[PDB]
Symmetry: C3
Subunit: 316 residues, 3 copies
């Protein structure tokens, strides 16, 4: 089917951690960018308007661009950039399945590295794996890093000379992340993305993960892991069988990454919380203002197209 | 079987490198912590006493805690921390096989990153791979990194702002590491652990490694490698067939990791030393004061239980 | 067969980036060092003369040294170093197949990390995989990093206190790299090497890669990837089916690596250029002064031997 939608690029500010507001170039004014969910073989048309002061493009990472290389989104290679105020249309066929993503391809060290110019592109295969048919919850986790020194300074950052001192999943640093709420017998698909410039060793307490896909393609030899290393550009899909009720933290195991501005704890941390486990008064998230769509799990259930999420929106 | 262990947490100083003494929080006063070696299905009980000035926990990495989540060791999530001077008891069934490990889960960037709060937990499968049955030597290699600026000062370290300038296997930097001594026909299982905050590209000269297990679970499709990347939290088990007598260095291939305080050589380096090879006068480790248990290989042969090792012990104040 | 080669080590300066000339210790005066291409089972003899001011060795990474450990090239372990002015002969049997490499093993953090002391050693199996049979182009990509503060002075570099601020493939930083020119229907074997001390997330636009070999040995379970993480010491071999004509960039996805001295773009970037695609006025590499052997692809067709390449030579 043909799926057409409209995306903008906006100058907004998001809160990454307590105390750290960050100027970003958000697709539809949000970080992560909107979810795009389509079916294998769909024809996609994306109309992009740059409402920022700098040039950008959008590259569709994982999308082959078969016979459509001029929609690959690479400035000086496949197109001239989308200047401030201008618009550009991408057209491609979603013939490559799985967990893909999209991001700016201008000034990538800064724009992708610290300005939030990325989001998920999920292509459902015609022939999912049998285990994918058992999935009851689909979870997107996009990891990235932040350089507090350039939080207010578009046009700066993302170099070797900078210091990445904050770390996140879906643009929040613990405790501003959200729990992964499950119930016993859930079958949870988690998609990890190396969205920013860091490496993330994603470890699930209480559970092993079955690694089923690399860069959205199914492995002939899936393997179990309790820690999955995710580097820039990569995706890994896993399955967790939610058969062990408790509260089980789930986090980046790289030691410096569970800090925030040199303070601990922080960083890419969530908690697998099972329904019905009694809550101790000392539980760090006992009073959480819960967002069930923090990992796009609700959006993923609502059809094919483009989805914004108000909890990812920044301020103008 | 029910297996019960009494563990302490101690403030000691260890020598990581020539001229680098480091204040650590050593389980039973050693870094790596004691080896815990049990069988699949055992019921484990660990009574922990905190003899340091700061709060800690112990998390059992890879242990599922099936029905026992309150023993997962995570402060603010599954327990309150073990305060200084206090005790706490962990109980879990070892129903997850393979190379596991344990580490503090309080202030982890510092405690696990530079204070040595970690050790190996080996769970023997009831049904091991056939190749595992050919093994004649079992070897633990726990890699980590150290920030010399915070060596003498608990309470700091383990941030992006710090500089990790020393590197080790089992908490020593070459030349203070020990050789891996084999003889022709040995079948060597090596268990790599990303215990600290760095990445380590472990390369064996003279041999390929057959990678058989990821995070302690056997791969359906094992593969050969001469360089295995190990990142925080992970374990890899490999087999080396010792069929090539020589002196073959075995080291982290990340170029800045074979330094110590900005000087070379140093870092996570050993040598696969074959017994039959005559020693040259210029060999760096001629006459080495040798520790046969530097990789826990002797302890690993001594039955199920918990094993200290004095080559890992630090000095009390 | 017995194959005997004479190699030298020379003090030369190379141009890594616009703005960065670097003093290196080039094997045969070039970086990458010469391609050594031999067959499984050959007896190799390499006579090395050290025409530099500092001691060196050559270690043959991935070569087992069966019966020949004294040629392993490790100072203080298998030999005394080759002093300045002196010569030394290596002998080994190439019984280990695949993508191997060679590098100095004296002061490795500096000599291999920033002084270019490395090159490729390709051992052809007497029995290649079936996929290798279809290959029409063979490509070598050796990634490394550079520290501009020590560019002019041997004896410093390669420590955690230094700053790696330039990144390359085959010792050039974009735009001084060269395109990978292909034609529709090509079957491209690419061999990635982690020659320096960095990690490189190599991502091909427009195509998936079939990962067929790890450290030169064929995988029982090959797998597709669009991004392959290459770390120090490792090699990965992939296959790309060149069936999607366009201009498709191919680069390290680690965000800070696509910079050069703090500025973007730079780093390990190439473009898969298909013959016949019209060149746009704004194409960055329009009119490139092209080197068809930048990835050793011409040398790799020339049989067994040791191959210098003038494009890699430094100046005295
Ligand atoms: Cl022997
Ligand atoms: Cu942009
Ligand atoms: Cu990308
Ligand atoms: Cu891409
Ligand atoms: Cu943990
Ligand atoms: Cu602790
Ligand atoms: Cu852990
Ligand atoms: Cu854990
Ligand atoms: Cu080596
Ligand atoms: Cu050298
Ligand atoms: Cu090497
Ligand atoms: Cu080697
Ligand atoms: Cu790209």
């Amino acid at each position: 089917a043909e799926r057409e939608f409209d995306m903008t690029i906006e100058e907004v500010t998001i809160k990454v951690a307590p105390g750290l507001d960050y100027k970003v170039f958000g697709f539809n004014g949000q970080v992560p960018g909107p979810l795009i969910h389509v079916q294998e073989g769909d024809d996609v048309i994306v109309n992009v308007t740059n409402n920022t002061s700098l040039p950008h493009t959008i590259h569709w990472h994982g999308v082959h661009q078969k016979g459509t290389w001029r929609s690959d989104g690479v400035p000086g290679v496949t197109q001239q950039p989308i200047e401030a105020g201008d618009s550009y249309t991408y057209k491609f066929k979603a013939d490559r399945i799985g967990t893909l993503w999209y991001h700016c391809h201008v000034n990538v060290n800064e724009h992708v590295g610290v300005r939030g110019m990325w989001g998920p592109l999920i292509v459902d295969p015609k022939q999912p794996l049998p285990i994918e048919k058992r999935v009851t919850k689909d979870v997107i986790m996009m990891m990235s890093t932040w350089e507090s020194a350039v939080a207010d300074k578009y046009g700066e950052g993302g170099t070797p000379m900078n210091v990445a001192d904050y770390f996140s999943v879906n643009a929040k640093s613990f405790p501003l992340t959200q729990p992964l709420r499950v119930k016993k017998g859930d079958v949870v698909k988690i998609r990890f993305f190396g969205a920013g410039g860091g490496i993330h060793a994603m470890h699930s307490h209480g559970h092993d993960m079955l690694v089923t896909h690399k860069d959205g393609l199914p492995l002939d030899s899936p393997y179990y892991a309790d820690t999955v290393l995710v580097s820039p550009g990569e995706r890994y899909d896993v399955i967790i069988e939610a058969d062990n009720p408790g509260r089980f933290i789930f986090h980046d195991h790289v030691d410096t990454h569970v800090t925030a501005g040199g303070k601990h704890p922080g960083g890419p941390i969530t908690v697998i919380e099972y329904d019905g486990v009694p809550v101790d008064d000392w539980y760090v998230w006992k009073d959480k203002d819960y967002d069930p769509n923090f990992f796009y799990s609700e959006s993923l259930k609502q059809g094919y197209g483009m989805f914004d999420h108000d909890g990812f929106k920044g301020e103008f």
